[model samples]
Target: LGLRRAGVRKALHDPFEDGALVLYEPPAISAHDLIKADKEKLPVHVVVDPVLSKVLRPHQREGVKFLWDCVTGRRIENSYGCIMADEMGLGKTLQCITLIWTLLKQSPDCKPEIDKVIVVSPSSLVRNWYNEVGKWLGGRVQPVAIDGGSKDEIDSKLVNFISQQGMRIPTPILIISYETFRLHAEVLHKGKVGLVICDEGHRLKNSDNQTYLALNSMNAQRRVLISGTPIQNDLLEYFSLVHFVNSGILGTAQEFKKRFEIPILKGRDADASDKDRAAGEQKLQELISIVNRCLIRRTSDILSKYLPVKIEQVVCCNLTPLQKELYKLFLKQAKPVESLQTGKISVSSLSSITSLKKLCNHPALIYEKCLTGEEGFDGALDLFPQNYSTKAVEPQLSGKMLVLDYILAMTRTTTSDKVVLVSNYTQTLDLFEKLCRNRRYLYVRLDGTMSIKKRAKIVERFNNPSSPEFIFMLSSKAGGCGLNLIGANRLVMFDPDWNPANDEQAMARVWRDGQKKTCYIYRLLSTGTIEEKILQRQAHKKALSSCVVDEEQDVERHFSLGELRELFSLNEKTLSDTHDRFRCRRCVNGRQVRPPPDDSDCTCDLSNWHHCADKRGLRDPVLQASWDAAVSFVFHQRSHEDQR
Candidate 1:
């Protein structure tokens, strides 16, 4: 039986690319037609059944239909279909969840309401899924939580739950990490599983990897593959997920690439060039012919009901005297990172700059002497408070403004609304709790430090309509993917990160799924300090400094963003899309979680990634998108409406 494939060649599918047919293959007829289809140069449309729901906007409905048709167009009976095509922070999870719920709800017998389910996701959101399921689906689905522990222990949990204890489970929803899936897929798929869902489905992009292999091993009658970044940095990334979604469907990766990616994407050969823009537009129309009817994308306007308008302001102040002294010390230290003689950046100088910036963010940064040589007596003794022995310089905002400021501002500004405050460091979250102590802020603090049970409680409290004015988040990682912070419109980043792109990932906490306000964001940065330069650097690079530390790069007003990601390269880091290097702060700093060979202090270790994941001052994805959009929005707003 020929499986349904996206786009490809006939010969590659049948008689097979490999006799074992192991290599890859597309559908027979579509495969043969693709060659002529390409020469004739046109895109094709997908077909989908029209379904209505007040929850989905017209465009969003269209986008969903487009994806549905793409996967199911082959007309296979009782086969699996994957929808892996939404943009980041574009409600991919909600879409998948809705689709899964709808499938079960629509077919009481075909899919069943209580079929055994296993959703593989990043550890960051093991509890998040449980809360969302309960909130949207009305607590009908019960999730199985698995964290980092002994393998045998986790396996026993799955076994006992699914086998002996399965009968007691009202709605079986097994939640496991991506790693756990590799270990437990075979066991989980043993019984009559109606569906197995993979969230952040991009983790399965590599067909050769275990994540893919184990997922493929699942014999579930229906598979749900979901990820915002359906097509990652490469079109090929879509393959692994697509294959698992409906395996016998798409022929092979090679063929899929030849049809969609290479011809249509790379060369735009199916359409026309700039000389024939209209012709190309017409071809694109052809590709959208069927898909336009199926796939769906909720527009910013349609998302308005889920979001409400919010206001923001920068609460700026002069750094304390101690903070100023520390700033000067860091500036002097940063000077060396620049070739003092030529005023150019050299490899050695770039490395020094990384150390200096760390000191600027916090004095604890210089404790281990990140610089090659032993730095001055803790860099600057003057920056310390009088007789100060505190662990690090903490923000000095008043108690009223420290953590509750956002909550107060939001509640006062809006009409009896609910809001969420996100942060990167848990140390500051203590301020939030302290401020709310006996004050009746009606809020909760959450971060990576919380237990699964504790996390579930916090989610429940905030999600409840009468909960509180503020929901404090200690870190983006803990709040990024699953929680729907649509209760309020205010998102304030008490501190900004190096990666502007990543900010969106965090801010997504309350922006997309169930939001009902015009989200507003505020970015707090200390004035007349290195932090200014940090923000300035991020403006040009569109990334954080961590991505560039190995290259000894500095976020200068002139240095471009892309060129900086390279490590040990002589080429001056230039800001351009074509630059060779690209590593963000977390990606670079994450390497330090393990002991380093040189025993050199990891500059990022100073940021406290362990506790930083749950700071009280940052919202991840929404703020990230807001920041980038803000820049563009400002550019679009001109003095005279742009010489029109």
Candidate 2:
């Protein structure tokens, strides 16, 4: 009874009487000492500011963290380099800005990780980089963009940037054009750059290029290369990119070729043996594992959460009588079949291919070439209409042009959506200009010939919703990479590119972040002509890229002798040669067995799309009326699930 009474009273008493309930207080530590001690023992936790973090998407937040860890020696031992190969419109710029801001302002030791950052972008985007930094950070950092100046002025600026590092207003970032950086590499190299960020870093894929060498020579240890299409033409170029970011990771170029490149490429050959393919697969996985340490790639599929649905349609248009006649005559004259049979592509063969592509665009292009009295095109003049004038806009003469005219008219009459017309040739752009002028549709044009400053203004004008520009004519080779034409929900790729990356970049111009409406992308290919061949070749290249970059197992083989012959021959009776070649399991007798699932990505494979030759499968109103007569076949796929 006595023990029970003592225990009950003790439990009721305050535990703080003996200081047992008091919170433990370690020795008081100064902020500096705590930071110094933590720097040695604890990992740095770099928190993104709430203002910026709140606006960043989930992928972007992860990207910022990935970059920080990569460049700060946390991800890989003794390596501070990485490749941010996120596809376009995924906000790569914003992620880089966040990382830059974090590194310049905060670190575990209370000392900034980087004092000066160098951003090397294309000439047109130099100012854009500077403006973006200011826009995102809001006076927290001042970045100097070296887009234009006299030689002396530029030298003075570089001198100032290098020598005046301790100024009261510290300019921690220098944004310069690739050409300018190459020219003044020595001057800039004198400075202590803590980090170098290369925007559109595919420009450095050529290791021998002066720009690549210039940046390689800089003393900066931490490097970040950003590109949507890192593997552009071949695996060697991919090795160049990986090497530039993380040197010695893949060994020397020759070593990489012997180990990974040769085996993988040999396996990609049309006639590769199973053993060779297995070896290639093994080498490929090995290379991917090594590069995966420093490389992070994400496709634009991530943007589906925040962006509108994208419907990419591939329309095969029948050639007009004139175009067909001209195409056959030119191919017969060039005699490319014999050369291809000999396994040698002559200069004339390439020119003939270009001529055919031009003819696919319009007979006027061929007429223009014929007027020049070129040797091969002497008799081509007879193929044109007797009364045809070179100055006239004859949309009906070209199958794709006729469809384009109808779409433009329907877009204006039925919807408020503007259009972006992209072509690989400036001459095709000229034809587009003529069509616009003849139709009295307000339009603007951007090509390589335009000045950098003027391009920004033209893009700004076209992107304005209230601006009367109904059509924006873009040269894919010039304005493909960085332009965002979200004002136009409709984009027409008038011609295809041999490299799928180029076409993909051009197509992404409209379906980017700021877009508000469902985006429609039409890639017009002349049915059973050289244009179809080009599209098929693009698929082959894309498959190659997917195998290496996306780590997919199904590797497509290269061109075969039979495939090469098909490039020259025309299958005019077929609805779509590409669809025929697909041998689709989903279709029977040129019609789908069932409607395609609603949630397929925009893949290059034609079988995955709904074959719209059945009439009921057609969705775009512009193609629903009588204008559909010109279209031989259409493969349509909505890129994302219908969020609505």
Candidate 3:
């Protein structure tokens, strides 16, 4: 089809949909005319390049220098930003840590004179930050509690850290979490945050996520973020990360949406429009220049010659009869929950498949419901396919533990080498550590629950090759990025996650170029479980999840049902299916679009949607509580059975 172009040469099209191809438009811009104007604003020599001082290894120095050069220039006006896309294990933490230290020296308004560096990271890494900071500055830099911390403790620490008369340090670097970042924003923002360094900052991809908003809302002179996988899924993820640092490079988001985002995300550029693509190419060139100027990044294999290399392997272990029986029973009761979870039915939905999964871990859970009262909204733990176990000392064994055993066997032969087992669940760590304790010197556990100094001490112990610290890792979501477990020669996962991008990032800690030993990576999940399918899905989905886009939501909810269910799934295949497209395979022999599936034929006699008649009578509270009690009874019965 013939089409015309606008200023940028993009083909403009009507917004109306025709159930066919949409068109891309290059909005006419006096802005392109203004592009030359920004060049004039570029500083011949950057003054802010000094936001960093000291001899940084060549790449690290270049990163900071380029950042300052871009920020103070016409690139980003109000805020200086863009993701520093370092490869996994390339010391993004050190680079960002240095940036914050530099910002502290430069921003005079910052108080706790030395204390205003706020390092925000995941709850699991709250301790990892302390460990990293201790490596550079010792006890001078402490990580404050973030999550799993009491409100009274937070309040008291806030007073002690910032008190006018009682405080001793010039400035105390407060440690906060993505969870606590939202809760204590008001008080925390009041402090002089000279340099706010967000470690593994990709969590803020959603513009409106609480952590992102809190960081933006905080008054800080220089802000920095650390992430390895930038621009993974789409340019918009890169766009959002860059937006956080400096909004002007691409202009306002509204301008970006009209010019770039919408077209790319919606496939609104399907029609033949080389003219518009050309203009976009020109603008994209400028954007790239601005990004390169401000963001500093490097890959591990490219830089180091000595880190242990990562190797991957697959294996399996038999399940106990208890686990097998639980799996069967869970499949029976959890089908309804699964049906509700995925709007679709049939074996394709795999909701019941997830239940069989919980059965492999513990058979007792399927007998009774797991949650009660208000907690049962989206899922009461009382519901089957339980993810947690608090009732016993010997927690249910996940397929992850089985994988852990295989890895331990390999490393146990090494005798003295350190290894790190990275997984997602704190529960997995708990079980892994317990098993390791029986092996004597095979395991050293470090999770989010440790204090800052204590965490540092543990890292020190783990890094010492002289000791029995052979394994060093948390589940990916727990301790993936922002960690320095360089002492280990092996990295293993009890199970793989939906996001392989992060898995790559975590394994990089061991696979990095350093030392002389070979690095090996292992991922263990039940052969038929969702985790098994996720690895393939990640091949297509990694790029999307690697981004940190800004997100927003109502205060009443923690996460949308779609998002929560999607994230919590941990099943890669199902998530990939959700992310890819709905399938009606018979309609397409490899076509991009397929015909819709047949509609459901409801034959149930009682399937009416009309409102129920209200019986105007005195309600009995006892009867209401009794109904609640009965539901609870059935729910726990199924959940308890699954746990067996």
Candidate 4:
């Protein structure tokens, strides 16, 4: 049987063997044939997608092109990194989104320039980034945001993401938080990333941080740092950001300090000699020339035309008797300045300052601290009223709180306007929440503890006109950077940050493009307190940033230890400590003798604003009513067409 079967198979195979296997070897194609096989392909002049181009403003169009040139190595030789230091509300995110879309879809050679993009942002903004990409690009691209998941789930997703190399369809973008990226950096480093975009990239100002190191280890050649304010505190931090984008562009840390930082700082000093000033200016110009090639920054003054009027008022609220007494008691007992001067027990001056700041906010905050028996509260408990209850919302005890209460009540009863209350401390936010609850004001809050997914819903709800929410409480550190809170035309900054950028970013939340009403930004400060000192410090820092980033001359005066020592002293006679320090050229015997000049820059020069100590003279009725006998001084400016 086996032999018979074998013979049948052999007989069947022999009949059509020659004709059955017909191999077709037609022609040999040249390289030109391969190149020209697709008639649609040519030397493509990559342009911004028309969908985006039509919507983009002139400046935004220029920004997209600038980014394209920088990231494609067109701006600088062999460098593919740039910093988008555009001020807030200039649509940095949109500009970057356009650049990414263009790079991902079209190139001069008709091949996508980057196969994958990694967007590193703050944890709270991870979902926001994903939403923004989806909103802008629609279904054209999908971006995965790793906000939260089980460790194993995250690892698997990351593995899947890394494995998508040279595929017909690949995940184009991955949005991860800085902490998450740092934790799983090694796994991410396994694959080659096409582009690395860092949102709120000022966080990378410290080169020694683990996050910066993790990002530095990535193999990605193209990097884009998006920061509203890059040069926040000092020139060294600026160097770190510049070096991160284009490594060694500004030389090593020590080299940059010696060559640029020291001379520039020396020149910026109040008492700098003429020789030092010249050297500083020369070094600054040289540094600016090199960095400007790879860096592009546009001010929000361009947005003034599109947005409504913005009135920025710095209200210096007088501390109530209780607050002043508590503040003085803390200073007298703690002696934070003396401790710093003598270097005795190493009592943290920062903590002492914080305690004073809390007292300035409310005597209740210090009372709570005293009850908890915290350090530096020694002999401070007796300062509170004997029958005072921490549970009660005592607005009268805090001058700013009183003014805020009046404003909130007036807005709620008189108009449809909403308010955004921003604070640097969570504890202060807690106070704001308590105040809202006590007043029965419909409110929503976004802070660090809030989940990333819920933040968008809350913001959307608040932004809806029909929504009943009257107040939105925001933590400046968490919700400040990339939030759009245009529903509220009024924003109250309950406190100031050491970095002016933080305060600026927080204040810009309401005065954005979509806002309709005249936006009012109130930066409340306790008169004759450390808050005033912080404001002064912010001015110096802003001036420094303007000099370096904006190429402006005439750096502001720097404060000395002697000036800092004045922080502990309370000036009950002066209405505004910060104003007094300005030594206004426009004021004569506390009266404005000279009006703000026509050629003044509203932001840098405090004297350029219309200043008044009496609330009766204020233009805004709400401010007049809210700050009646409470606010000691007000520096008000309106953002008209000519102000910028």
What CA RMSD would you report for each candidate? 15.7, 9.8, 19.3, 12.0
Q: Candidate 2: how many backbone clashes? A: 0
lDDT of 3 by residue, 562-593 (tens): 64344223332221232233333322232323
CA lDDT, candidate 1, residue 530: 38
Rank candidates by TM-score, best first. Answer: 4, 2, 3, 1
Best by lDDT: 4
- lDDT per residue for candidate 1 within 1-644, as digits (tens), equals 34635454222223322212111122245666766664323322211112223455444555554434333333343345554544345555555555555444332122234356677777877777766666556655566688667888988877765773433556567778887778777776567666676765644544447886676566665665654331322433344554455444444556644444344443454545665555444434443332222223332333433334333333232343444455455545544433333345455445554543443334444445533345433446544545543343333422113223434543544446565666555544554555455345666667666776777676666766776546555566565555666665556555555544344456556555555545554445444333444444454442221121212144333344332322112111121111112222332322323322232111112221211111223333332222311111110000111112
Comparing 2 and 3 on TM-score, the stronger one: 2
TM-score each candidate: 0.57, 0.81, 0.60, 0.83
Cα-based lDDT for every prediction? 0.46, 0.73, 0.48, 0.74
Tally clashing residue pairs in candidate 4. 0
Worst 10 residues of 3 by lDDT: 632-641
Query: For model 4, how does the per-residue alpha-carbon lDDT over 1-644 read when each residue is reduced to its tens digit?
Result: 24435422122112223222111112355788867676444343465565666567778878887888888777776778888888776667778888888777666565678888899988866766777776677777888878567877878878877788564545778998887788877787748787889988776654447876687667577889887664433444566666667653554557777888789889989999999989998987776666777778887666777888787889988899888877776777777666654322323665787778788888877787787766667666777766788677788889888888888998888788999999988888888888988999989988666665677689889989999999999877665444788889899999887767767777888877678888888989988888888787678766666422221111112333675577567888888988888888877776777778764434646767888876645657788777677888998877774343
Which sequence of candidate numbers ranks them by lDDT, best first?
Answer: 4, 2, 3, 1
Count of backbone collisions in candidate 3 = 84
Checking candidate 2 for backbone clashes, the offending pairs are none
